[PDB]
Design a protein around this ligand. Structure first.
Ligand SMILES: *[C@@H]1O[C@H](CO)[C@@H](O[C@@H]2O[C@H](CO)[C@@H](O)[C@H](O)[C@H]2NC(C)=O)[C@H](O)[C@H]1NC(C)=O
Ligand SMILES: *[C@@H]1O[C@H](CO)[C@@H](O[C@@H]2O[C@H](CO)[C@@H](O)[C@H](O)[C@H]2NC(C)=O)[C@H](O)[C@H]1NC(C)=O
Ligand SMILES: *[C@@H]1O[C@H](CO)[C@@H](O[C@@H]2O[C@H](CO)[C@@H](O)[C@H](O)[C@H]2NC(C)=O)[C@H](O)[C@H]1NC(C)=O
Ligand SMILES: *[C@@H]1O[C@H](CO)[C@@H](O[C@@H]2O[C@H](CO)[C@@H](O)[C@H](O)[C@H]2NC(C)=O)[C@H](O)[C@H]1NC(C)=O
Ligand SMILES: *[C@@H]1O[C@H](CO)[C@@H](O[C@@H]2O[C@H](CO)[C@@H](O)[C@H](O)[C@H]2NC(C)=O)[C@H](O)[C@H]1NC(C)=O
Ligand SMILES: *[C@@H]1O[C@H](CO)[C@@H](O[C@@H]2O[C@H](CO)[C@@H](O)[C@H](O)[C@H]2NC(C)=O)[C@H](O)[C@H]1NC(C)=O
Ligand SMILES: *[C@@H]1O[C@H](CO)[C@@H](O[C@@H]2O[C@H](CO)[C@@H](O)[C@H](O)[C@H]2NC(C)=O)[C@H](O)[C@H]1NC(C)=O
Ligand SMILES: *[C@@H]1O[C@H](CO)[C@@H](O[C@@H]2O[C@H](CO)[C@@H](O)[C@H](O)[C@H]2NC(C)=O)[C@H](O)[C@H]1NC(C)=O
Ligand SMILES: *[C@@H]1O[C@H](CO)[C@@H](O)[C@H](O)[C@H]1NC(C)=O
Ligand SMILES: *[C@@H]1O[C@H](CO)[C@@H](O)[C@H](O)[C@H]1NC(C)=O
Ligand SMILES: *[C@@H]1O[C@H](CO)[C@@H](O)[C@H](O)[C@H]1NC(C)=O
Ligand SMILES: *[C@@H]1O[C@H](CO)[C@@H](O)[C@H](O)[C@H]1NC(C)=O
Ligand SMILES: *[C@@H]1O[C@H](CO)[C@@H](O)[C@H](O)[C@H]1NC(C)=O
Ligand SMILES: *[C@@H]1O[C@H](CO)[C@@H](O)[C@H](O)[C@H]1NC(C)=O
Ligand SMILES: *[C@@H]1O[C@H](CO)[C@@H](O)[C@H](O)[C@H]1NC(C)=O
Ligand SMILES: *[C@@H]1O[C@H](CO)[C@@H](O)[C@H](O)[C@H]1NC(C)=O
Lengths: 309, 212, 146, 407, 48
């Protein structure tokens, strides 16, 4: 609120704000226009499925163990055991913080519906109706899509399931990283604190306190010195808004990339090199994070080459 | 002799309670790891505040004398403490050049124009400073060459005297039948408060590149 | 200002107005640069889709509409572009029983392309995107392993 | 909403139009007590006053001065104050308060004043021309006059030259008016310099003994000294008002705290250095200071082409501090819409999972649904294959340019 | 170096400049944040 920041419950200052025109109109619209986009950013990443899909109670897929990425019916709200690591590792004078539209419980179900669709229906639910197919047969299709024949999977099914299950279990050790999320929280917190601290600058006045100047001085002079405080504090507040628009574009650019990966890495199989992890892309599973999304990329990597003529 | 202080002469810069808040303050302190003179006496300078530590179970220190001339014809401060309690007093005195049955108080022989009255091993630390005519004293008595540790000192008095000080002396109880003198400099520290609101640690912001 | 004031004091009053209105121009131009970067990012996306959705066929999911991309037609709009996305959407599914391979003469047969389905009494090979059964022969399959 | 948008037709949505703002009531100025009242009690009650030629002199120190006992005493005859007004004695601050007291004849009180003359004011007690003190003088016949003559109080009436202001002379050297030196023997042109007021109860006014006291301030160089007394006003709690704690000026709601100050600290601050707790000087209890209840006000409208009903959201305002259908959400208090138990598609987003719609007519507001639910018929040997298809067409719109401007 | 541009090593100006708060800390943080990304930009294009 521009009035409580600049004047702070002072009628002499409040009337002086009328001589500057519509600066507060610009300030409110600039911050509101980028606040609305923040809810749009999260809808475009997670709300890419029409139905809320569920897995069967018989959680067992050709030998693959998905219990660390699926919701665990015995936890705060409804997170997977891995999402719990992700969420556990991470009114002053007008400076108000607005709540997000989507709660963390609402993001968790969007992510659990995407997970159920890709395990029971492969990549068919993203082009129409969800079509069931057994999982072992989904993985065989996915090998075909990278140049490997399907008999190589079916005769080694136990090995690939053992390797996948161990590879997933290593994720919790690497998490128990998230600097890309912590930097966003810290950069905005430091901007809010700096904005408050500019309320103790004189900006060429005798005192920083509006209830001081006017009280002991002379009204004709108090008006000029209060206008210097208004100008200096307005410039601070305008600097805050300009940097929020510059930072809002960086968050939107990241959210557009995250939405693109959701469709091309989770709802399908990509051939784009390095786009969906390192190696030959097979599949991806989303996980929710406090202000973002974490992708688990599963890739095929060849090993143990021999020489031939 | 001279000795090496460790982390000594840190006092509560002001009122204002506070919790877990790594607060940064600028004030007059005794720098950490400083060169403090040692005495076992002569008029010493003042220049800007004084640190004063001592060690002894008995009470050898029997007050201080402050002022600009340490003589008559002008007013000075005199602080004594008999077995009752501390007695602040500001008069024009005539001090013995060597001030010191069980009869005592041969320090002065004049007490004119008094403008202030008041009546009411072991480590006994004091911090003395004189700013805008106010003579502040911090102190603390903690039971056990000085040892090594940290302990913040709390305000003791508030004395609207007006007195100027450039030199001072000390008073000792003789035998008829050990103290330190530091000075304060403008330094900056980073003070760590616990949940009870006390200072538990500090960083001297003008020592080693790591502290910066 | 001049009409009712001397120069010594009028220079100060005009300098205040100049500073204020000069700040207005700095605010205006800074926002145009920040907003022009956003329309530029949009023009880059539109140019990329023009190449990949209109001048070819894309396999990128949801990049060229919802469904399986067949083709797209551009239309001009004021200050923008409109894409008419033509997609392939399957409909009216039936369920079948399936198996990964078939045994014959003690050898495993795998489909070249397609899936094995059963209508209840007989097994057929079908293509994966449209139900069209054919009889399982040695020209439809290949052998690998036991 | 119409006025903020500058239109008479508002489209469906939610608009931020204004702000709530709780207001403080009452103004409580709190302080401690008085501790040392710096006892005037004796200089106005000394049983044995001093004769004018050798007048007593008591100097106040750093104290608490409460002149309300003087002005409201009720038993005076003369009380004139020259430097400062008699009522503003309790809002100023001076360094040294000197207090003189003596007794003099009745019709001579007109001489304890700046710039006078006469056998008393000339050389017994001389007030300067730039006096700043305060003169009090009353009648004390029944206390100091004893029949038969009370010859204790003297008053000099011979001296070489007049006195200096605030000076004192107590000598007893025999006067010398003639030309022949005296050699300290009374008689011809050699007079004793001291006489005595012989008071008796059967005198008229103007000859009965009056008691005179004078106050005199002077502010040499001290930073601060004895000032006037503070003041009260009952202390209330749980009501954001306007408070002052011995200098700490602020606004907010006072509540019992759970912090523990050190036994020398008055108030606490939070991170970012803003006062958030104080200690009451009188009761020595720690009280938290929370901000009132301000916040934005938004208007929820179905669109003027649908209805003119509206609901209002007070952002992060508790529903007990707002001043039918009142609904509490994590985003504030929603008034004018009902809370249903069904779940619909979101229409107008409120926040924290809550949306509003114009369906069921006044205006309501339920939870948020999440879409239709559907189980996939998965098994370990079942597949679903399409037997038909459709061709779909969809639009996508992208901006490519703005208008080119030049200033 | 904020001080050297605005005042240019003058004790009267530099003491008055302190009355404006911490603008010279914001300028340094902004320039540091974009100067670190210049090596990150190069590192991610070539270190493949
Ligand atoms: C899938 O992996 C989970 C662990 O991530 C297995 O759960 C563990 O099972 C063992 C044996 O019963 C227990 O000792 C552990 O306490 C379990 N862990 C947890 C967190 O409950 C689970 O059994 C695996 N599923 C299958 C089918 O093998
Ligand atoms: C392919 O490599 C894997 C290892 O990456 C081999 O599997 C391991 O084999 C050793 C030796 O028999 C076992 O001790 C390990 O437990 C196996 N690992 C797993 C995860 O099962 C595998 O044998 C190799 N295949 C061939 C044909 O050599
Ligand atoms: C294929 O054969 C080449 C030689 O033609 C092997 O090259 C060797 O490489 C190592 C370093 O990795 C050198 O130290 C040897 O001197 C090389 N050998 C010769 C004969 O030149 C290569 O290792 C072989 N590849 C595999 C997978 O075995
Ligand atoms: C599965 O499809 C087959 C083939 O259409 C059906 O079997 C019969 O097959 C003979 C040839 O072997 C044909 O002459 C008959 O016309 C077929 N009957 C029918 C009804 O199509 C078989 O009936 C189908 N099974 C089920 C359960 O519908
Ligand atoms: C200031 O004066 C008040 C009285 O006006 C003191 O209040 C007393 O407080 C004690 C407890 O500390 C109670 O036992 C007494 O009954 C209180 N007296 C009255 C009349 O209520 C207060 O303690 C004084 N403050 C200081 C710091 O001395
Ligand atoms: C000034 O002196 C008078 C008498 O010497 C004091 O009078 C007292 O009055 C109160 C109220 O009636 C009585 O309760 C006391 O008993 C009186 N004192 C005596 C000794 O009897 C008066 O209090 C004195 N002034 C002040 C401020 O104390
Ligand atoms: C294929 O079979 C599955 C069952 O194996 C069908 O799913 C059932 O559908 C009915 C009708 O909607 C539901 O009442 C059942 O609850 C479903 N069963 C399960 C286990 O989910 C599916 O509809 C069939 N597909 C077609 C095209 O008929
Ligand atoms: C695939 O779907 C289309 C409809 O979308 C079917 O075509 C219709 O068939 C009915 C008779 O069943 C005719 O009356 C309509 O005129 C047809 N519509 C059109 C547009 O031609 C088609 O028969 C379906 N295929 C199968 C195998 O059921
Ligand atoms: C302190 O400084 C003096 C010189 O002023 C030096 O002689 C002495 O050794 C120093 N003391 C220590 C402990 O370094
Ligand atoms: C303690 O010293 C003070 C100052 O000399 C003196 O006024 C007081 O009477 C002394 N107490 C005793 C018990 O001698
Ligand atoms: C201080 O004492 C001297 C006598 O020693 C006296 O002349 C002078 O008036 C006194 N000063 C004050 C302020 O009482
Ligand atoms: C202390 O001495 C300084 C000169 O060094 C003088 O200017 C100042 O007025 C003195 N302070 C007091 C309180 O006398
Ligand atoms: C002081 O702090 C200690 C921890 O250092 C804590 O246990 C204790 O309760 C505190 N005391 C009070 C009175 O709060
Ligand atoms: C808006 O008003 C027009 C008539 O002016 C009407 O035709 C139309 O249905 C209205 N729209 C809605 C959403 O009610
Ligand atoms: C509003 O205040 C009451 C106590 O007066 C409390 O019970 C209630 O929980 C508060 N509401 C909110 C939303 O904090
Ligand atoms: C909604 O359901 C709850 C029980 O889950 C019930 O207590 C409540 O009264 C219902 N609300 C309405 C408006 O009927």
């Amino acid at each position: 609120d521009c009035t409580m920041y600049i004047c702070g419950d002072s009628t002499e200052c409040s009337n002086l704000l009328l001589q500057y025109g519509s600066f507060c109109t610009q300030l409110k619209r600039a911050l509101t226009g980028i606040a609305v986009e923040q809810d749009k950013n999260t809808q475009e990443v997670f709300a890419q499925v029409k139905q809320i899909y569920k897995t069967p109670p018989i959680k067992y897929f050709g030998g693959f163990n998905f219990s660390q990425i699926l919701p665990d019916p015995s936890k705060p709200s409804k997170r997977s055991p891995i999402e719990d690591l992700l969420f556990n590792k991470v009114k002053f004078n007008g400076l108000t913080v607005l709540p997000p539209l989507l709660t963390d419980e609402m993001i968790a179900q969007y992510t659990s519906a995407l997970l159920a669709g890709t395990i029971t229906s492969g990549w068919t639910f993203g082009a129409g109706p969800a079509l069931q197919i057994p999982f072992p047969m989904q993985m065989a299709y996915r090998f075909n899509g990278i140049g490997v024949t399907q008999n190589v999977l079916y005769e080694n099914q136990k090995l690939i399931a053992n390797q996948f299950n161990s590879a997933i279990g290593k994720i919790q050790d690497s998490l128990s990283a998230l600097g890309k999320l912590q930097d966003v929280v810290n950069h905005n917190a430091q901007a809010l604190n700096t904005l408050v601290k500019q309320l103790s600058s004189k900006f060429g006045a005798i005192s920083s306190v509006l209830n001081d100047i006017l009280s002991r001085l002379d009204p004709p002079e108090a008006e000029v010195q209060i206008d210097r405080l208004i100008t200096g504090r307005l410039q601070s507040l305008q600097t805050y808004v300009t940097q929020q628009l510059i930072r809002a574009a960086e968050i939107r650019a990241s959210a557009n990339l995250a939405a693109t990966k959701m469709s091309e890495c989770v709802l399908g199989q990509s051939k784009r090199v390095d786009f969906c992890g390192k190696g030959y892309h097979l599949m991806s599973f989303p996980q929710s994070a406090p202000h973002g999304v974490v992708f688990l990329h599963v890739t095929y990597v060849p090993a143990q080459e021999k020489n031939f003529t | 002799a001279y000795t090496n202080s460790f982390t000594r002469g840190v006092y509560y810069p002001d009122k204002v309670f506070r919790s877990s808040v790594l607060h940064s303050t600028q004030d007059l302190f005794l720098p950490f790891f400083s060169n403090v003179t040692w005495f076992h006496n002569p008029v010493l300078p003042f220049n800007d505040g004084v640190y004063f530590a001592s060690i002894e179970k008995s009470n050898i220190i029997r007050g201080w004398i402050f002022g600009t001339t340490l003589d008559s014809k002008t007013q000075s401060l005199l602080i004594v403490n008999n077995a009752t309690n501390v007695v602040i007093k500001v008069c024009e005195f005539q001090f013995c050049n060597d001030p010191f049955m069980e009869s005592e108080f041969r320090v002065y022989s004049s007490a004119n124009n008094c403008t202030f009255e008041y009546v009411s091993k072991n480590l006994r630390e004091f911090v003395f400073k004189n700013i805008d005519g106010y003579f502040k004293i911090y102190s603390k008595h903690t039971p056990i060459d000085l040892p090594q540790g940290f302990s913040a000192l709390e305000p003791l008095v508030d004395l609207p005297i007006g007195i100027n000080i450039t030199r001072f002396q000390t008073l000792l109880a003789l035998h008829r039948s050990a103290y330190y003198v530091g000075y304060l400099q403008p330094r900056t520290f980073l003070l760590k408060y616990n949940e009870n609101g006390t200072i538990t640690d500090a960083v001297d912001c003008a020592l080693d590149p790591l502290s910066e | 200002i001049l009409s009712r004031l001397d120069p010594p004091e009028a220079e100060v009053q005009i300098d205040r107005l100049i500073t204020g209105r000069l700040q207005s121009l700095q605010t205006y131009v800074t926002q145009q640069l920040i907003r022009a970067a956003e329309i530029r990012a949009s023009a880059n996306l539109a140019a990329t889709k023009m190449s990949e959705c209109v001048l070819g066929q894309s396999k990128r999911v949801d990049f060229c509409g919802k469904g399986y991309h067949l083709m797209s037609f551009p239309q001009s709009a004021p200050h923008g572009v409109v894409f008419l996305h033509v997609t392939y959407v399957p409909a009216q599914e039936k369920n079948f029983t399936t198996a990964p391979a078939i045994c014959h003469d003690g050898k495993a047969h795998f489909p070249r392309e397609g899936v094995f389905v059963s209508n209840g009494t007989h097994w057929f090979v079908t293509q994966r995107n449209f139900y069209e059964p054919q009889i399982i022969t040695t020209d439809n399959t290949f052998v690998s392993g036991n | 909403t119409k006025c903020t948008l500058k239109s008479f037709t508002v489209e469906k949505g939610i608009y931020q139009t204004s702000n709530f703002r709780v207001q403080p009531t009452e103004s409580i100025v709190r302080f401690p007590n008085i501790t040392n009242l710096c006892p005037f009690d004796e200089v106005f009650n000394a049983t044995r006053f001093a004769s004018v030629y050798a007048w007593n002199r008591k100097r106040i120190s750093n104290c608490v001065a409460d002149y309300s006992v003087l002005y409201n005493f009720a038993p005076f005859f003369t009380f004139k104050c020259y430097g400062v007004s008699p009522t503003k004695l309790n809002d100023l601050c001076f360094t040294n308060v000197y207090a003189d007291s003596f007794v003099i004849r009745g019709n001579e009180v007109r001489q304890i004043a700046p710039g006078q003359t006469g056998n008393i004011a000339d050389y017994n007690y001389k007030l300067p021309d730039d006096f700043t003190g305060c003169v009090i003088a009353w009648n004390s016949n029944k206390l100091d006059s004893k029949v038969s003559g009370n010859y204790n109080y003297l008053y000099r009436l011979f001296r070489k030259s007049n006195l200096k202001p605030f000076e004192r002379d107590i000598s007893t050297e025999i006067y010398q008016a003639g030309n022949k030196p005296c050699n300290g023997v009374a008689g011809f042109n050699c007079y004793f310099p001291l006489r005595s007021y012989g008071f008796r109860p059967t005198y008229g006014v103007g000859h009965q003994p009056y008691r005179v006291v004078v106050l005199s301030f002077e502010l040499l160089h001290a930073p601060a000294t004895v000032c006037g007394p503070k003041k009260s006003t009952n202390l209330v709690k749980n009501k954001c008002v306007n408070f002052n704690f011995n200098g700490l000026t602020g606004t907010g709601v006072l509540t019992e705290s759970n912090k523990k100050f050190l036994p020398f600290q008055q108030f606490g601050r939070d991170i970012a250095d803003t006062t958030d707790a104080v200690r009451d000087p009188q009761t020595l209890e720690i009280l938290d200071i929370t901000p009132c209840s301000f916040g934005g006000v938004s208007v929820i409208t179905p669109g003027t082409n649908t209805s003119n009903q509206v609901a209002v959201l007070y952002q992060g305002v508790n529903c007990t501090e707002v001043p039918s259908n009142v609904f509490q959400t994590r985003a504030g208090c929603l008034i004018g819409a009902e809370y249903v138990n069904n779940s619909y598609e979101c229409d107008i987003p409120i926040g924290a999972g809550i949306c509003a719609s114009y369906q069921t007519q006044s205006i309501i507001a339920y939870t948020m649904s999440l879409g239709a639910e559907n189980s996939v018929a998965y098994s370990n040997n079942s597949i679903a294959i399409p037997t038909n298809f459709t061709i779909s067409v969809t639009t996508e719109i992208l901006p490519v340019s703005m208008t080119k401007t030049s200033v």
